[PDB]
Amino acid sequence: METDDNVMALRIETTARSYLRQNTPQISVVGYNRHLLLLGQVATEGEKQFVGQIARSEQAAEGVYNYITVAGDTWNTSKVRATLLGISPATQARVKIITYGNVTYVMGILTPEEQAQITQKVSTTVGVQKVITLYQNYENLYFQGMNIFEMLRIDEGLRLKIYKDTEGYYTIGIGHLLTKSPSLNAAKSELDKAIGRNTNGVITKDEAEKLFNQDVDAAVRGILRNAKLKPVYDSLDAVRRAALINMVFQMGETGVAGFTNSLRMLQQKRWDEAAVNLAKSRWYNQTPNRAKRVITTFRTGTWDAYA
Ligand SMILES: [Cl-]
Numbered sequence: 541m542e543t544d545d546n547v548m549a550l551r552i553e554t555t556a557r558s559y560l561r562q563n564t565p566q567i568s569v570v571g572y573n574r575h576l577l578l579l580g581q582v583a584t585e586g587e588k589q590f591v592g593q594i595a596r597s598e599q600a601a602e603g604v605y606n607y608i609t610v611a612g613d614t615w616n617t618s619k620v621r622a623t624l625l626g627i628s629p630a631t632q633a634r635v636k637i638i639t640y641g642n643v644t645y646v647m648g649i650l651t652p653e654e655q656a657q658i659t660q661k662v663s664t665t666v667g668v669q670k671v672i673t674l675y676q677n678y679e680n681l682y683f684q685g686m687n688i689f690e691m692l693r694i695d696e697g698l699r700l701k702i703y704k705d706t707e708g709y710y711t712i713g714i715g716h717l718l719t720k721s722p723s724l725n726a727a728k729s730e731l732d733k734a735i736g737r738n739t740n741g742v743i744t745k746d747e748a749e750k751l752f753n754q755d756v757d758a759a760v761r762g763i764l765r766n767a768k769l770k771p772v773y774d775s776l777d778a779v780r781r782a783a784l785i786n787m788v789f790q791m792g793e794t795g796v797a798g799f800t801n802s803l804r805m806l807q808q809k810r811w812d813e814a815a816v817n818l819a820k821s822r823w824y825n826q827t828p829n830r831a832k833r834v835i836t837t838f839r840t841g842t843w844d845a846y847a
């Protein structure tokens with residue numbers, strides 16, 4: 541859903557901008573849950589209606605909201621938390637907020653009760669600004685296919701040059717750390733190590749996916765030697781296995797092993813009880829978007845949140 545929302549939005553942004561310049565321009569498409577929100581300033585009511593047909597021609601779109609005016613910025617996680625104090629971190633994760641012009645749009649899959657609460661909180665934070673709600677209540681196979689490599693591409697990023705992480709070390713690819721020394725030369729040599737050539741501090745995607753496989757294998761061995769992680773891992777299907785490998789990549793073997801109660805529920809296949817519980821940890825607090833995708837993967841056993 542992450543990849544389809546973005547994929548469609550850009551195709552609509554780009555095919556729409558093309559049509560406008562054939563009659564500088566202002567068009568913006570935002571995608572949430574395959575529902576699409578059209579933003580910008582067009583000159584005539586007929587063009588606004590034509591840009592809306594472009595979007596509705598997207599077979600994978602299950603809704604289109606045309607809010608183009610006839611002559612922006614998405615809220616970041618912290619700014620939403622400043623505004624939704626009192627709502628659980630889990631419910632805040634099912635909400636996108638955008639301000640385009642002098643309007644503020646609120647998208648999300650909410651209970652009728654949750655809608656009135658969040659609508660209230662947003663209206664009091666913006667004051668006398670217009671607030672548009674776009675709520676939903678509680679074949680198509682041409683898109684990219686999701687796998688574990690594309691999963692951790694969305695959750696960490698793909699870097700094809702040696703970059704410094706946050707801890708002051710050197711890294712490349714998908715979080716594949718090279719060395720904790722501040723010596724770049726030390727990192728460039730270790731980069732040649734795993735690739736076996738004159739990388740020159742640069743790699744291709746084909747040979748970054750080769751690293752990512754080495755990193756995945758390394759995790760799966762730590763997992764099978766850890767007394768708490770092994771039985772859970774063995775009992776789970778393929779997608780749910782990549783959810784677990786995701787958490788290990790993020791917190792290390794020992795970190796994940798501390799989720800005692802949530803692990804017992806996964807090994808017991810209680811998918812929904814395991815989700816309510818994982819959404820109560822510091823993990824959800826400090827990386828809610830990721831933890832929302834990882835946790836839905838655990839609940840559905842599918843690539844929904846990522847597709
Ligand atoms: Cl933030």
Ligand SMILES: [Cl-]
Nearest residue numbers: 827828829830
């Ligand atoms: Cl996050």
